[PDB]
Amino acid sequence: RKRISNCVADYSVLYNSASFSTFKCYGVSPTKLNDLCFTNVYADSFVIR
Amino acid sequence: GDEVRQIAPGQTGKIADYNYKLPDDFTGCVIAWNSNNLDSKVGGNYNYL
């Protein structure tokens, strides 16, 4: 779990990349992220089947 | 083939935002079928932009 903070995130570039087989947002829309100001972000990475 | 989901109404993406979008209240039927053998060549059938 890598913490993200004290930065400006341009989520548009992540969503526009077709390399991702799944990009699903459950409480927000990916387009709206670009205009949204958050408290803290937890980026968790793992490899699964 | 991966873009078939974006064809559904209320979706988003490059296909859903740059070349083809369905209305939110879409009424109708969507029909699809693979045409790899029909319209694909080993050298690259670049006719589909």
From Swiss-Prot, chain A:
Attaches the virion to the cell membrane by interacting with host receptor, initiating the infection. The major receptor is host ACE2. When S2/S2' has been cleaved, binding to the receptor triggers direct fusion at the cell membrane. When S2/S2' has not been cleaved, binding to the receptor results in internalization of the virus by endocytosis using host TFRC and GRM2 and leading to fusion of the virion membrane with the host endosomal membrane. Alternatively, may use NRP1/NRP2 and integrin as entry receptors. Binds to host ACE2. RBD also interacts with the N-linked glycan on 'Asn-90' of ACE2. Cleavage of S generates a polybasic C-terminal sequence on S1 that binds to host Neuropilin-1 (NRP1) and Neuropilin-2 (NRP2) receptors. Interacts with host integrin alpha-5/beta-1 (ITGA5:ITGB1) and with ACE2 in complex with integrin alpha-5/beta-1 (ITGA5:ITGB1). May interact via cytoplasmic c-terminus with M protein. May interact (via N-terminus) with host bilirubin and biliverdin, thereby preventing antibody binding to the SARS-CoV-2 spike NTD via an allosteric mechanism. This is Spike protein S1. The lineage of its organism: Viruses, Riboviria, Orthornavirae, Pisuviricota, Pisoniviricetes.
Curated annotation (Swiss-Prot), chain B:
This is Spike protein S1. Attaches the virion to the cell membrane by interacting with host receptor, initiating the infection. The major receptor is host ACE2. When S2/S2' has been cleaved, binding to the receptor triggers direct fusion at the cell membrane. When S2/S2' has not been cleaved, binding to the receptor results in internalization of the virus by endocytosis using host TFRC and GRM2 and leading to fusion of the virion membrane with the host endosomal membrane. Alternatively, may use NRP1/NRP2 and integrin as entry receptors. It comes from the Viruses. Binds to host ACE2. RBD also interacts with the N-linked glycan on 'Asn-90' of ACE2. Cleavage of S generates a polybasic C-terminal sequence on S1 that binds to host Neuropilin-1 (NRP1) and Neuropilin-2 (NRP2) receptors. Interacts with host integrin alpha-5/beta-1 (ITGA5:ITGB1) and with ACE2 in complex with integrin alpha-5/beta-1 (ITGA5:ITGB1). May interact via cytoplasmic c-terminus with M protein. May interact (via N-terminus) with host bilirubin and biliverdin, thereby preventing antibody binding to the SARS-CoV-2 spike NTD via an allosteric mechanism. Residues 1-2 are annotated as: Integrin-binding motif. Changing residue 5 to S: In strain: Omicron/BA.2, Omicron/BA.2.12.1, Omicron/BA.2.75, Omicron/BA.4, Omicron/BA.5, Omicron/BQ.1.1, Omicron/XBB.1.5, Omicron/EG.5.1.
